[PDB]
Design a protein around this ligand. Structure first.
Ligand SMILES: NC(=O)c1ccc[n+]([C@@H]2O[C@H](COP(=O)([O-])OP(=O)(O)OC[C@H]3O[C@@H](n4cnc5c(N)ncnc54)[C@H](OP(=O)(O)O)[C@@H]3O)[C@@H](O)[C@H]2O)c1
Ligand SMILES: Nc1nc(=O)c2nc(CNc3ccc(C(=O)N[C@@H](CCC(=O)O)C(=O)O)cc3)cnc2[nH]1
Length: 159
């Protein structure tokens, strides 16, 4: 199956100028717990903002262009990206906005982190209609001396 994972601020802001405007490490641990030993598909701008490969995962980059780094796999369409994952239990789509938009219809599960922050951004997660989605898990955390916002983890599965 295909799953999307994303961290959303208020009004579904997911980014600004390609950046990590928030250093919330509990959500990073959640991201790694849920993408470890799976293929991860990302768009080229998200690849350039991560800065490096994510180790322990098959990194597949969508770009209309050929490869600029042979440490990762390059694909030039959605059909090719899914094919390049091979037969697996779960394909993780890790953004960004343009890529989330395209894989939402082909998505059976959402891993969403909702962060209590406002950050005047320039990229937004898809405005699905949640009627098509059921929440199957919601785990809320208040701020700590390590994460300076409250956040909810949510898993949503297509009904
Ligand atoms: N908060 C989160 O969870 C989260 C997660 C991921 C990313 N982000 C943020 O999202 C922002 C970047 O998102 P973005 O929407 O600008 O870019 P993106 O989706 O990461 O990448 C867009 C690029 O991917 C390629 N691409 C997309 N669809 C393609 C297709 N069907 N076929 C071939 N190539 C395709 C294209 O590369 P070419 O132009 O080379 O052709 C396109 O320009 C950043 O700010 C990032 O920090 C946030
Ligand atoms: N919930 C969620 N959190 C995120 O941080 C996230 N990030 C992306 C894409 N951006 C990034 C940026 C950095 C790293 C990263 O450095 N990952 C490391 C964590 C650092 C560590 O190992 O301690 C990793 O190995 O997973 C991953 C994805 C997409 N969806 C997400 N979804």
């Amino acid at each position: 199956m295909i799953s999307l994972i994303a961290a959303l601020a208020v009004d579904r802001v997911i980014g600004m100028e390609n950046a990590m405007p928030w250093n919330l490490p509990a959500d990073l641990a959640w991201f790694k717990r849920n993408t470890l030993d799976k293929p991860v598909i990302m768009g080229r701008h998200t690849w350039e903002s991560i800065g490096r490969p994510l180790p322990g995962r098959k990194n597949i980059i969508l770009s209309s262009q050929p490869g600029t780094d042979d440490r990762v796999t390059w694909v030039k369409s959605v059909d090719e990206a899914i094919a390049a994952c091979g037969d697996v239990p779960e394909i993780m789509v890790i953004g960004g906005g343009r890529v989330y938009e395209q894989f939402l219809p082909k998505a059976q599960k959402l891993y969403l982190t909702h962060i209590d922050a406002e950050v005047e951004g320039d990229t937004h997660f898809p405005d699905y209609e949640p009627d098509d989605w059921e929440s199957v898990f919601s785990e809320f955390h208040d701020a700590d001396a390590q994460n300076s916002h409250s956040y909810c983890f949510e898993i949503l599965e297509r009904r």
